[PDB]
Design a protein around this motif. Structure first.
Motif, PDB file in Angstrom:
ATOM      1  N   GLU A 113      -4.343  -1.917  -1.975  1.00  0.00           N
ATOM      2  CA  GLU A 113      -4.397  -2.912  -1.102  1.00  0.00           C
ATOM      3  C   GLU A 113      -5.149  -2.928  -0.100  1.00  0.00           C
ATOM      4  OE1 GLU A 113      -2.349  -0.152  -1.382  1.00  0.00           O
ATOM      5  OE2 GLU A 113      -0.088  -0.225  -1.116  1.00  0.00           O
ATOM      6  N   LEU A 135      -5.082  11.247  -2.900  1.00  0.00           N
ATOM      7  CA  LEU A 135      -5.892  12.089  -2.201  1.00  0.00           C
ATOM      8  C   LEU A 135      -7.136  12.304  -2.861  1.00  0.00           C
ATOM      9  CD1 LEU A 135      -3.080  14.448  -0.596  1.00  0.00           C
ATOM     10  CD2 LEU A 135      -3.646  12.181  -0.462  1.00  0.00           C
ATOM     11  N   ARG A 140       6.448   4.467   3.701  1.00  0.00           N
ATOM     12  CA  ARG A 140       5.931   5.928   3.293  1.00  0.00           C
ATOM     13  C   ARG A 140       6.470   6.884   4.121  1.00  0.00           C
ATOM     14  NH1 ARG A 140       0.545   2.812   2.324  1.00  0.00           N
ATOM     15  NH2 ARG A 140       0.850   1.942   0.424  1.00  0.00           N
ATOM     16  N   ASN A 181       1.556   1.019   8.034  1.00  0.00           N
ATOM     17  CA  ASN A 181       0.227   0.700   8.789  1.00  0.00           C
ATOM     18  C   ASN A 181       0.108  -0.681   8.560  1.00  0.00           C
ATOM     19  OD1 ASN A 181      -0.169   0.530   6.021  1.00  0.00           O
ATOM     20  ND2 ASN A 181      -1.876   1.938   5.934  1.00  0.00           N
ATOM     21  N   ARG A 212      -7.097   9.458   2.015  1.00  0.00           N
ATOM     22  CA  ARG A 212      -5.907   9.081   1.176  1.00  0.00           C
ATOM     23  C   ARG A 212      -5.993   7.363   1.016  1.00  0.00           C
ATOM     24  NH1 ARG A 212      -2.864  11.541   6.349  1.00  0.00           N
ATOM     25  NH2 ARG A 212      -4.719  12.753   5.691  1.00  0.00           N
ATOM     26  N   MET A 252       7.870   3.392  -0.951  1.00  0.00           N
ATOM     27  CA  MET A 252       8.251   2.205  -1.285  1.00  0.00           C
ATOM     28  C   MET A 252       7.406   1.048  -1.047  1.00  0.00           C
ATOM     29  SD  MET A 252      11.548   0.366   0.074  1.00  0.00           S
ATOM     30  CE  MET A 252      10.865   0.643   1.834  1.00  0.00           C
ATOM     31  N   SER A 253       7.149   0.257  -2.298  1.00  0.00           N
ATOM     32  CA  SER A 253       6.041  -0.859  -2.027  1.00  0.00           C
ATOM     33  C   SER A 253       6.552  -1.885  -1.282  1.00  0.00           C
ATOM     34  CB  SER A 253       5.983  -1.535  -3.426  1.00  0.00           C
ATOM     35  OG  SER A 253       7.088  -2.061  -3.876  1.00  0.00           O
ATOM     36  N   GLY A 273      -1.951  -3.393  10.507  1.00  0.00           N
ATOM     37  CA  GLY A 273      -3.271  -3.547  11.264  1.00  0.00           C
ATOM     38  C   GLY A 273      -3.865  -2.106  11.315  1.00  0.00           C
ATOM     39  N   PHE A 274      -3.870  -1.546  12.592  1.00  0.00           N
ATOM     40  CA  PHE A 274      -4.213  -0.302  12.796  1.00  0.00           C
ATOM     41  C   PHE A 274      -3.118   0.669  12.227  1.00  0.00           C
ATOM     42  CE2 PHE A 274      -7.912  -1.165  15.710  1.00  0.00           C
ATOM     43  CZ  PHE A 274      -8.764  -0.409  15.034  1.00  0.00           C
ATOM     44  N   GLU A 275      -3.520   1.607  11.715  1.00  0.00           N
ATOM     45  CA  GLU A 275      -2.656   2.886  11.160  1.00  0.00           C
ATOM     46  C   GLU A 275      -1.738   3.109  12.402  1.00  0.00           C
ATOM     47  OE1 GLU A 275      -2.177   6.194  11.606  1.00  0.00           O
ATOM     48  OE2 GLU A 275      -0.481   6.328  10.149  1.00  0.00           O
ATOM     49  N   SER A 295       7.687   4.784  -5.597  1.00  0.00           N
ATOM     50  CA  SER A 295       6.576   6.060  -6.179  1.00  0.00           C
ATOM     51  C   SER A 295       6.832   7.323  -5.311  1.00  0.00           C
ATOM     52  CB  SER A 295       5.161   5.360  -5.908  1.00  0.00           C
ATOM     53  OG  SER A 295       4.313   6.627  -6.368  1.00  0.00           O
ATOM     54  N   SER A 314      -9.972   3.166  11.685  1.00  0.00           N
ATOM     55  CA  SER A 314     -10.525   1.769  10.808  1.00  0.00           C
ATOM     56  C   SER A 314      -9.365   0.824  10.652  1.00  0.00           C
ATOM     57  CB  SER A 314     -11.198   2.113   9.816  1.00  0.00           C
ATOM     58  OG  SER A 314     -10.668   2.818   8.795  1.00  0.00           O
ATOM     59  N   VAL A 315      -9.771  -0.473  10.920  1.00  0.00           N
ATOM     60  CA  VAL A 315      -8.875  -1.563  10.837  1.00  0.00           C
ATOM     61  C   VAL A 315      -9.371  -2.708  10.040  1.00  0.00           C
ATOM     62  CG1 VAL A 315      -8.822  -2.755  12.957  1.00  0.00           C
ATOM     63  CG2 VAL A 315      -6.798  -3.063  11.674  1.00  0.00           C
ATOM     64  N   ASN A 351      -4.247   3.988  -0.681  1.00  0.00           N
ATOM     65  CA  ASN A 351      -3.154   3.407  -0.975  1.00  0.00           C
ATOM     66  C   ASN A 351      -2.989   2.443  -2.045  1.00  0.00           C
ATOM     67  OD1 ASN A 351      -3.113   3.658   2.633  1.00  0.00           O
ATOM     68  ND2 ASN A 351      -1.358   4.600   1.597  1.00  0.00           N
ATOM     69  N   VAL A 352      -1.834   2.533  -2.807  1.00  0.00           N
ATOM     70  CA  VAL A 352      -1.707   1.484  -3.936  1.00  0.00           C
ATOM     71  C   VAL A 352      -0.503   0.823  -3.913  1.00  0.00           C
ATOM     72  CG1 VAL A 352      -1.200   1.799  -6.360  1.00  0.00           C
ATOM     73  CG2 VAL A 352      -2.644   3.368  -5.636  1.00  0.00           C
ATOM     74  N   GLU A 353      -0.577  -0.322  -4.581  1.00  0.00           N
ATOM     75  CA  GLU A 353       0.457  -1.470  -4.276  1.00  0.00           C
ATOM     76  C   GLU A 353       2.017  -0.857  -4.262  1.00  0.00           C
ATOM     77  OE1 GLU A 353      -0.692  -4.356  -6.898  1.00  0.00           O
ATOM     78  OE2 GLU A 353       0.255  -3.355  -8.788  1.00  0.00           O
ATOM     79  N   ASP A 354       2.050  -0.201  -5.366  1.00  0.00           N
ATOM     80  CA  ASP A 354       3.343   0.592  -5.856  1.00  0.00           C
ATOM     81  C   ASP A 354       3.846   1.483  -4.666  1.00  0.00           C
ATOM     82  OD1 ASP A 354       1.758   2.661  -6.537  1.00  0.00           O
ATOM     83  OD2 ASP A 354       2.605   2.871  -8.463  1.00  0.00           O
ATOM     84  N   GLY A 355       2.796   1.891  -3.778  1.00  0.00           N
ATOM     85  CA  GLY A 355       3.131   3.049  -2.799  1.00  0.00           C
ATOM     86  C   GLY A 355       2.297   4.325  -3.188  1.00  0.00           C
ATOM     87  N   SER A 356       1.722   4.292  -4.332  1.00  0.00           N
ATOM     88  CA  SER A 356       1.146   5.639  -4.802  1.00  0.00           C
ATOM     89  C   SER A 356      -0.212   5.917  -3.799  1.00  0.00           C
ATOM     90  CB  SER A 356       0.497   5.454  -6.191  1.00  0.00           C
ATOM     91  OG  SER A 356       1.640   5.705  -7.095  1.00  0.00           O
ATOM     92  N   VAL A 357      -0.198   7.068  -3.745  1.00  0.00           N
ATOM     93  CA  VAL A 357      -1.137   7.553  -2.620  1.00  0.00           C
ATOM     94  C   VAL A 357      -2.420   8.475  -3.188  1.00  0.00           C
ATOM     95  CG1 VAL A 357      -1.709   8.838  -0.238  1.00  0.00           C
ATOM     96  CG2 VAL A 357       0.361   7.445  -0.636  1.00  0.00           C
ATOM     97  N   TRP A 408       1.905  13.042   0.904  1.00  0.00           N
ATOM     98  CA  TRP A 408       2.796  12.105   0.548  1.00  0.00           C
ATOM     99  C   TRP A 408       3.833  12.417  -0.438  1.00  0.00           C
ATOM    100  CZ3 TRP A 408       3.102   8.279  -3.776  1.00  0.00           C
ATOM    101  CH2 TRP A 408       4.057   7.224  -3.098  1.00  0.00           C
ATOM    102  N   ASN A 426      -5.204  -2.218   3.102  1.00  0.00           N
ATOM    103  CA  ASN A 426      -4.930  -1.497   4.299  1.00  0.00           C
ATOM    104  C   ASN A 426      -5.817  -0.437   4.251  1.00  0.00           C
ATOM    105  OD1 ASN A 426      -1.734  -3.025   3.910  1.00  0.00           O
ATOM    106  ND2 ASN A 426      -2.760  -3.130   5.827  1.00  0.00           N
ATOM    107  N   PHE A 427      -5.756   0.184   5.497  1.00  0.00           N
ATOM    108  CA  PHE A 427      -6.772   1.311   5.508  1.00  0.00           C
ATOM    109  C   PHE A 427      -5.711   2.509   6.272  1.00  0.00           C
ATOM    110  CE2 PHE A 427     -11.081   0.802   3.796  1.00  0.00           C
ATOM    111  CZ  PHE A 427     -10.843  -0.266   3.606  1.00  0.00           C
ATOM    112  N   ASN A 428      -6.450   3.660   6.593  1.00  0.00           N
ATOM    113  CA  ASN A 428      -5.697   4.801   7.339  1.00  0.00           C
ATOM    114  C   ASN A 428      -6.941   5.625   8.196  1.00  0.00           C
ATOM    115  OD1 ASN A 428      -2.969   4.787   6.115  1.00  0.00           O
ATOM    116  ND2 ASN A 428      -4.121   5.161   4.128  1.00  0.00           N
TER     117      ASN A 428
END
Lengths: 220, 114, 116
Positions: free
Chosen positions: A135, A171, B35, B99, A161, B51-52, B101-103, B59, A198-199, A163-169, B47, A137-139
């Motif tokens: 996606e 590392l 998540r 998350n 970490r 859920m998407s 915007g900002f996480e 996942s 970061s945003v 992120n993936v659209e299905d939620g997969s993370v 993790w 987004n960031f962390n």
């Protein structure tokens, strides 16, 4: 670097025979510990997801990052700013492959400049990066910094970490080695960790992919 | 502006069933993914479930896949996680993450099988 | 190295003992303290035992817990009585080399503790 400093970062890289270059501009305030950037790929399409390279473009320079008063002398990156430094980074993705990058950062004239060369290896179709499932987004993350007198350089390590659209993370392990181009005093710090927040935002004004990017990096 | 509050943490003997619930405030839940991370005392965070944003698929990690069986209701603005089968490896504590915007990290709750 | 163990989820009114031991030879030279971290609140001072033997406990917990340093075993144990739901905080063990008050240098991983 004191006060507001403009920055222009241009780089090019190859991934599985696909060559792509990204150029961007922005400004950083070390006193306020803030960094703003805007990137764009001159090539029509960038084969992999942006974030996997947004991380590299961001963590390629630490001069802008603010540090506490006690750690101001401890910082190595600011000391080597006048004559620049070269970073070699190895990133091992969680089964998505590997990045090998070499970057040079230096204060050219009265403006800061960063250049990067990237190579991607061990990539296969149906993967997360191949499928563009990541996606936008960031962390936030934490990066550990330690000195090394044998190589006369600073070594950084951490886990990112994605992120993936299905939620997969995913590392991914990130390791960095730095070599000061200059011959001046290093002031290498023994150990310290930097937290990065970061945003990412987009500007509806243009159709071009913007990747408007904001960082707040603080040491401790 | 925005907050996440997770509850339902309680100690469970092996073989029991437990339900955790993460509620949100200040933002919609339907428009973003959810998540659940896990970290053991003195261990790196990892993790375990998620859920998407669309909600079509969820996942999990290799070990816990099929155990968590997560669910979401947009109107409730709360996500629910079901322990199902329990193993000692679940002694680590859980964190709720989304998350926008900002996480943002939620304070979460600690759960240990004992 | 400081190792703390002996914690587990229990019901209210139970007595559990948390054992802290430093593998670094002697422990008597080291002032030994215990602190608790709530799930989402600031850390708090549980108790402390010093070189002179004086034992200090916080007012909230006074009269309920006890620290004992065993000369025979060279280990510091915190015994709990009348445990209550307010004590869900995770417990950590620390030590300081300076007899006078201050920050503790050593630290332990900690174990979760719970009530009904």
């Amino acid at each position: 670097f004191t006060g507001v400093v403009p920055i222009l970062v241009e780089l090019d890289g190859d991934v599985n025979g696909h060559k792509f270059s990204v150029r961007g501009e922005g400004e950083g305030d070390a006193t306020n510990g803030k960094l703003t950037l805007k990137f764009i790929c001159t090539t029509g399409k960038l084969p992999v997801p942006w974030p996997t390279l947004v991380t590299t473009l961001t963590y390629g320079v630490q001069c802008f990052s603010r540090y506490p008063d006690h750690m101001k002398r401890h910082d190595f990156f600011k000391s080597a700013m006048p004559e620049g430094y070269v970073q070699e980074r190895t990133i091992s993705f969680k089964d998505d492959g590997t990045y090998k990058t070499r970057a040079e950062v230096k204060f050219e004239g009265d403006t800061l400049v960063n250049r990067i060369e990237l190579k991607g290896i061990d990539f296969k179709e149906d993967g997360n990066i191949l499928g563009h499932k990541l996606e936008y987004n960031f962390n936030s993350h934490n990066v550990y910094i330690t000195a090394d007198k044998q190589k006369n350089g600073i070594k950084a390590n951490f886990k990112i970490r994605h992120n993936v659209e299905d939620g997969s993370v995913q590392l991914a392990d990130h390791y960095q080695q730095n070599t000061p181009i200059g011959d001046g005093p290093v002031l290498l710090p023994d150990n310290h960790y930097l937290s990065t927040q970061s945003v990412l935002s987009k500007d509806p004004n243009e159709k071009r992919d913007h990747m408007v990017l904001l960082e707040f990096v603080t040491a401790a | 502006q925005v907050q996440l509050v997770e509850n339902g943490g309680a100690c469970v003997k092996p073989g029991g069933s437990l339900r955790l619930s993460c509620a949100a405030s200040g933002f919609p839940v339907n428009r973003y993914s959810m998540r659940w991370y896990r970290q053991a005392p003195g261990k790196e965070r990892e993790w375990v479930a998620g859920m998407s944003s669309a909600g079509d698929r969820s996942s999990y990690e290799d070990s816990v896949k099929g155990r968590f069986t997560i669910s979401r209701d947009d109107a409730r603005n709360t996500v629910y996680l079901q322990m199902n089968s329990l193993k000692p490896e679940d002694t680590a504590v859980y964190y709720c993450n989304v998350n926008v915007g900002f996480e943002y990290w939620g304070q979460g709750t600690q759960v240990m099988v004992s | 190295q400081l190792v703390e163990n002996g914690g587990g989820c229990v019901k209210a009114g139970g007595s559990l003992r948390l054992s802290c031991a430093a593998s670094q030879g002697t422990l008597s030279n080291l002032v030994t303290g215990w602190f608790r971290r709530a799930p989402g609140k600031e850390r708090e001072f549980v108790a402390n035992i010093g070189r002179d033997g004086l034992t200090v406990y916080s007012n909230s917990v006074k009269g309920r817990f006890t620290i004992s340093r065993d000369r025979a075993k060279n280990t510091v144990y915190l015994q709990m009585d009348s445990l209550k739901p307010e004590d869900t905080a995770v417990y950590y063990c620390a030590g300081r080399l300076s007899r006078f008050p201050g920050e503790y240098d050593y630290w332990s991983k900690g174990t979760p503790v719970m009530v009904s």
